[PDB]
Amino acid sequence: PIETVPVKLKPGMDGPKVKQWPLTEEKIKALVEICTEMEKEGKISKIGPENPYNTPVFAIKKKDSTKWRKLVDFRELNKRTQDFWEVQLGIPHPAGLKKKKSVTVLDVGDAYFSVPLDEDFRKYTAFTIPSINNETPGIRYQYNVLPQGWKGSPAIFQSSMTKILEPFKKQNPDIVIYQYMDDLYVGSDLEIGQHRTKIEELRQHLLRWGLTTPGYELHPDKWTVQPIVLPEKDSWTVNDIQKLVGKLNWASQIYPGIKVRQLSKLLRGTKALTEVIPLTEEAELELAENREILKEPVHGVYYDPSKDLIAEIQKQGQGQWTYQIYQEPFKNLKTGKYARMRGAHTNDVKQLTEAVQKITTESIVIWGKTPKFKLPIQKETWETWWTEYWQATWIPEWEFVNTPPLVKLWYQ
Amino acid sequence: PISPIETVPVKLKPGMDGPKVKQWPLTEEKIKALVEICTEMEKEGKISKIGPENPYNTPVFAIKKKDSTKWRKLVDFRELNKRTQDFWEVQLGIPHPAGLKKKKSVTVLDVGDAYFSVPLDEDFRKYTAFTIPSINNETPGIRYQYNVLPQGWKGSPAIFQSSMTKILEPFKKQNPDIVIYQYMDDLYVGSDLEIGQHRTKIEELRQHLLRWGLTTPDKKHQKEPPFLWMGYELHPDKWTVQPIVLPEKDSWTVNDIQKLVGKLNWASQIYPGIKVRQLSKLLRGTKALTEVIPLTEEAELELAENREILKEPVHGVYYDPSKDLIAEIQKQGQGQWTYQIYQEPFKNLKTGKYARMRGAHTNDVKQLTEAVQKITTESIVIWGKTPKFKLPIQKETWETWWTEYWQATWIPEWEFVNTPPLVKLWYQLEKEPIVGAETFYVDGAANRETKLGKAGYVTNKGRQKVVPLTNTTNQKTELQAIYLALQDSGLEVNIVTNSQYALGIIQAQPDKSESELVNQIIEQLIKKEKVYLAWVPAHKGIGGNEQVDKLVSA
DNA sequence: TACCCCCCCTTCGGTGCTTTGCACCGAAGGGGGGG
C-alpha cells in the first residue's frame, strides 16, 4: 500500500524485445524455485504472449555464495529508461569514496521488493523462463515491485534509502556511503576491525527497517596505475631498437614530446635484426628524455560526466591482463594490469570475466559509472561461457574487437 | 455466447483499423469441402453470422490435410497481421528425443480442432470478418466472424500455447511425477507408474482436458510403440527418424539440390558423417530456382557416399541423467566436422555436423573451437549441461594455440583422442629474431587510379627484387612483398614489414584462406623452418623500410 | 496465395577499422523438420 512513482520510457522509444538464451539445468531449477516463492509473495505474477516485451534472465552465485541469486539482464531496458535515472531522480557521486582506505559492498537488492511498481511500466519488465529440451513452452512473468537490477529501482527507493541511512549517517558522520544498483558501497578510514564492526551496525540498522543482506572488501587507495615503461638493455639489437621505435611512435599519440629522430638515425642502414647496435650520445639522450616524459601525466586528461566510459583490455599472456579506461581516445582516465586471477594459466574466458568485474567495480567507485567494454574475444566464444563465471549483480555494456598486438605498448 | 476457458486480450497497432481486402477467386471444388465444415462451425458457436455493420473482409482458401482425405481451412491474414499488435512467442525451441529420459509407460495424444477449442477475445472478434463464396456468383454467401482462434493468424499459435499451459498447470501440480511434453496440441505423457495405473491417470487428464473443452480423439490417441512423435519413431529403449526419401531425379535443378541439402541436414542429427559441402557448392550465385545445373564429380561422389550411410538403418538412445555426457568430434576436411553425443560407448544419443566457414582466413584450431561451442549450446538446450569432449587435437597443440593467441579462447573439459586426421598448427612464428638468418625489409604500394603497384624487398646481404603488379590494391601489394621474401629466402628468414593488415592475418596462423595469394603465403610458411615477423612504422626513416619504400614507389 | 518455432547454406550489404579496401556479422530467402 504505497504510492507508485510513474515511469515513462525515453521519448519515441519502444520497450525491450530480447530473446531468452539457453540455460543450464542447475540455473533453471534455481530460477523456477526463486520465481515460485516470489510469486506466492506477490513480487511477480504470470503473464501471456499479449505482452510483446521480454528481457533475458539467468542465475548466478556471488563469490563464495553457495546460494543461487536471480539476475535479469535489464541492459536493454536501462538504455530506454535513461531519462529517468540520470536527469530526474539521479544520485550524486561521492568523489571521496575512492579515497577511503576500505570500502565494503552490500547486496541491498532485497529491499526493492518493498516498494510497488507503476502499473503502466510493469509491461516492460517481462521475462521468460525456458525449459530443458523445450518440454514446456516459455513461462512468462512480470514484476509488480521494483526489480533487482533495474536502474530506476535505486532512484525511486532513494528517498526511502536516505531516511534509513540518516540515523547512521549522523551517528557516524565521516563514513561515506554510495548506492549503485542493487549494491551499497560503504567506506571508512577506520581500522579493519572498526570498519567491519560498523558494517554489522549498518546491517542491523537495516534489519529493523525490513531488509536482509545475504561482504566484498575493497581498498581504493591501494589501487596502482600502470604506466608505459621502456626496457633496460646493456646491448641493443636492430630488432630491439626497431621494436622500441615502433613503441615510442605509438606512444606519441599520448605524450606528444616523444622524439625518434636520433633513434631512427641508428637504423638508417639495412642491417640484420640480431646485429648489435651501440647507442650514440644523442640517441641515449633522446632515450633518456623520453623515459622522463613517460613519467609525466598526460596533459589535459579529466573526467566528463556527460560522456560514456570506454574500457579496452589486452591479453598479455602468462596470466597477465592490462586495461585502460578512457572517454576520448588516448586521454586515459586510468590504466592498470591484473595477474594471478582465478582461472589463470588454464581458462581465458574466466580471467576475462573476472577482469571485467574488477574494472567495473573500480569504475563505480571512482566515477559512479559502468564502462562499455571492448573485449578481445570472439562473440560466440564469449556468449557461450560468460554466464558460468559471472558473480556480479550488474552487467556492463560490451562489444568485441580483434586488434593483433603489433606493438606491445602496455606491457613489456 | 458461452465461455469455455479464460480469454486473452488482443489489440491492434495503435491508430490503425482492420482488414478490408477482397476475396480470392476460389475454385468450386474447394468450396464444396469448404462450406461443408464451415456451416457446421456455426452450430458449435465457433463461427457466427454478422450483419453489414461489420465492414471488414479477408481472403480464404483451403488445403488438404497432409496424409489425409480431410480438408483444413486457412485464412490469408497477411494484411491483418501487418496491422496486428506484436506478440512474444513462448515456443523457444523444439524437443529432441535425445533429451527424453526413459519412462516405463508412454502415451501420445493430439487435440482435435485445437485452435477452434480456444475462445478468441470478445472485442477483437469483429476483425476476422470474411465472406464465403458459392457455386455461382449470384448468391452472396454469409459473412462470418471468428469466435475462436483462426488458422492463419499471427497470434493463433502463441495464444493456444499459453492457454494450454494454464490448463495443464493444475494437473501438473497434482501429478508432479508425470512428464508432459507440451508442443502445441501434441502431448507426450510418460511416467514410471505401472501401465495399469498409467492409463488411469491418462483418463483423468483426458477428462481434465475435456472439462476445459479439449477433445482427445482415439484416432489421434496412441497407446503402443513405436510412437510417432515429432517426426521420430520412439521405441522403449531406442528412437530414430521417420524414413527419409532422397529424390531420384536424373537431371537436377536448383530446387532439387535445395531439397536434397535440407533432407541431409535433417538426417545429420542421427546418421553420422553426413557431408553437404560439395552439394552446396552448386547453389552459390545461381539466379533461377528452376535452372538446371550439372553435378560435379565432387558432388556426385558426396551424394553417393551419403546414400550409403542412409542405406543401413541407425538409431539413437535416451538420456540417463546419472551417467556423464560425452561428445567426440572428427575432422572431415574442407572445413567440415561431425560429432557424436553419447553416454555408453557406441550407443549414440544424437549426431550432428558443423561446417560453417567463418571469416576469410581461418585454421583447423579456430574451426574446432567453433564446433565445440556449437555442441555446447546444443547440449545446454537439450540436457542443460555441457558434455565432456574427446577432441582429435594433442593437448600440447591446444596449449600452444590458446596461450599464444592474442584473443581469449577456451575449451571445456576435454581429452585427446588419437583418431586421425589430427588437428595441428602448420607453422610457428619465432618470438625473437633468428641469428644467422637473412633479414628481408619488405614493402608494397599501389596506385589508387592506375591499379598498378610494386612489391619488393631489400636485405642486409644486398639482395633485392621489385615486381610490377597489375590490377592490384595497396593491401595485396603488402601481402605480395611478403610472398616475395618468403620465396627468395632460405629455411630461416627474418621479415620486416610495415603492413598492419598483413601481419594481423599471418600472426593468426591460418591454414586456409579465401584469398589464393594468402594460400601461397601459407604454403610457403609451412615449408620454412624458422620465420620471424616484425613490424616498423612507415616513413620514419627506419632500416631498409625507408630504402624499399623508395623502390616500390618509383 | 495463411500462421508460429527450431536447424543449415547462401547471398548481400551495413558497420568500422585492417580504410575507401577488407573483414565481419546479422537479416533474409532457399531448403529440411514440427504443430
Ligand SMILES: Cc1cn([C@H]2C[C@H](O)[C@@H](COP(=O)(O)OP(=O)(O)OP(=O)(O)O)O2)c(=O)[nH]c1=O
Ligand atoms: C499441421 C498444421 C497445424 N496448424 C495449426 C492449426 C492447428 O489447430 C494446430 C494443430 O494442427 P493439427 O494437430 O494437425 O490438427 P487439429 O489440431 O486441428 O485437430 P485434428 O488433429 O483432429 O485434425 O496448429 C497450421 O496452422 N498449419 C498446419 O499445416
Ligand SMILES: [Ca+2]
Ligand atoms: Ca490436432
